Amino acid sequence: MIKQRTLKNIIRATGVGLHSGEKVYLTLKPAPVDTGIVFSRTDLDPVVEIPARAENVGETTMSTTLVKGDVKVDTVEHLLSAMAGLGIDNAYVELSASEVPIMDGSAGPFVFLIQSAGLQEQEAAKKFIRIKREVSVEEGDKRAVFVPFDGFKVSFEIDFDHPVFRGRTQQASVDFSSTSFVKEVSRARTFGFMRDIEYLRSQNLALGGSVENAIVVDENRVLNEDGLRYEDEFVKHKILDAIGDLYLLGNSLIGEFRGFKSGHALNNQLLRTLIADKDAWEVVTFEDARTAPISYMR
Ligand SMILES: Nc1ccc(C#CC#Cc2ccc(C(=O)N[C@@H](Cc3cnc[nH]3)C(=O)NO)cc2)cc1
Ligand SMILES: [Zn+2]
Ligand SMILES: [Zn+2]
Ligand SMILES: [Zn+2]
Numbered sequence: 001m002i003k004q005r006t007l008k009n010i011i012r013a014t015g016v017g018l019h020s021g022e023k024v025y026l027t028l029k030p031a032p033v034d035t036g037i038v039f040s041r042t043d044l045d046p047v048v049e050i051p052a053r054a055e056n057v058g059e060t061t062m063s064t065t066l067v068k069g070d071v072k073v074d075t076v077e078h079l080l081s082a083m084a085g086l087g088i089d090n091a092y093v094e095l096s097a098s099e100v101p102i103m104d105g106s107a108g109p110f111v112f113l114i115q116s117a118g119l120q121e122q123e124a125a126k127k128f129i130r131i132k133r134e135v136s137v138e139e140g141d142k143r144a145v146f147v148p149f150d151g152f153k154v155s156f157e158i159d160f161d162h163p164v165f166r167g168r169t170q171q172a173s174v175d176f177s178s179t180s181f182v183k184e185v186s187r188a189r190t191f192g193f194m195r196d197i198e199y200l201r202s203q204n205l206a207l208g209g210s211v212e213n214a215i216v217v218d219e220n221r222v223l224n225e226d227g228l229r230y231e232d233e234f235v236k237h238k239i240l241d242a243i244g245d246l247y248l249l250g251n252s253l254i255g256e257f258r259g260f261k262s263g264h265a266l267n268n269q270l271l272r273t274l275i276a277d278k279d280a281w282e283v284v285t286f287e288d289a290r291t292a293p294i295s296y297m298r
Contacts, residue, residue: 002126002286004089006030008118015101018075021207024101027094028113033124035090036250037083039073043096054248054271060264064245074099081244082110085181087296105189105213107240111182119298125285131255133280137269144266146274149256151293152176156238156259164217172235187229188236191215
């Protein structure tokens with residue numbers, strides 16, 4: 001059978017919050033079967049735990065934020081993307097502050113931490129959510145869709161008209177049958193438009209942001225000296241973001257996500273909308289791994 005997995009060891013890193021600029025301690029820990037991913041604010045007294053589930057998502061304007069009452073964990077998407085890509089079912093994530101460290105702006109440092117901690121197979125069947133019927137949400141010209149697919153695929157299109165984006169592909173469709181999340185998606189850095197970053201900074205926001213953790217573009221050029229890690233790094237990051245947001249379903253997906261200029265808000269709306277309609281999905285397991293359309297071989 002395809003088994004659930006967790007980490008073999010506890011592992012740690014430090015960084016700064018993108019929004020807050022606040023130095024933060026991060027800890028990843030193994031967790032028992034059927035735990036899912038659980039975030040814990042260890043700085044608070046008492047310690048506050050927030051399961052990484054769609055129903056716990058609060059604000060989604062800049063990043064995906066988990067909330068429990070007045071307590072938040074901000075910017076969970078890049079870490080969750082790594083958890084999803086490596087097929088980690090169960091883990092505890094401890095934080096000393098209200099935001100996951102931005103690290104290098106991608107999911108790479110988290111893939112690094114997870115792989116370094118080691119992967120532990122557990123004695124329980126891994127559960128998958130299979131899309132049975134196409135479900136969509138939109139807001140204006142933005143659209144997010146789940147489509148049935150015998151495997152796992154993420155497609156995305158962005159549509160920027162700024163000169164800096166002219167001629168760029170602005171589209172990608174990744175079938176993970178033959179694409180490596182680690183090698184071809186995970187290291188895609190977040191990006192920001194200079195005008196927007198200036199506005200945030202003017203309000204004392206985005207304090208942790210720098211060219212060392214984000215691709216910065218003005219109307220016309222990429223400001224980063226070294227260019228891009230992937231030729232299509234911008235759309236690859238949108239795909240990364242979607243994979244992280246999608247993992248709030250609590251299980252790996254058998255199906256396709258299609259995004260069109262979509263963001264965390266639409267992503268979460270899509271999740272809640274899917275979850276609510278029981279005719280559009282089912283939970284499946286695989287007693288024989290070679291019968292599965294998906295593989296988390298390592
Ligand atoms: N000298 C100097 C100093 C500081 C800086 C800087 C900076 C920065 C930044 C920044 C802020 C917000 C975002 C963000 O919203 N990115 C989105 C996705 C997204 C949404 N809209 C655009 N992108 C995202 O990846 N969410 O997961 C990303 C980056 C630059 C130069
Ligand atoms: Zn423009
Ligand atoms: Zn992102
Ligand atoms: Zn909703």
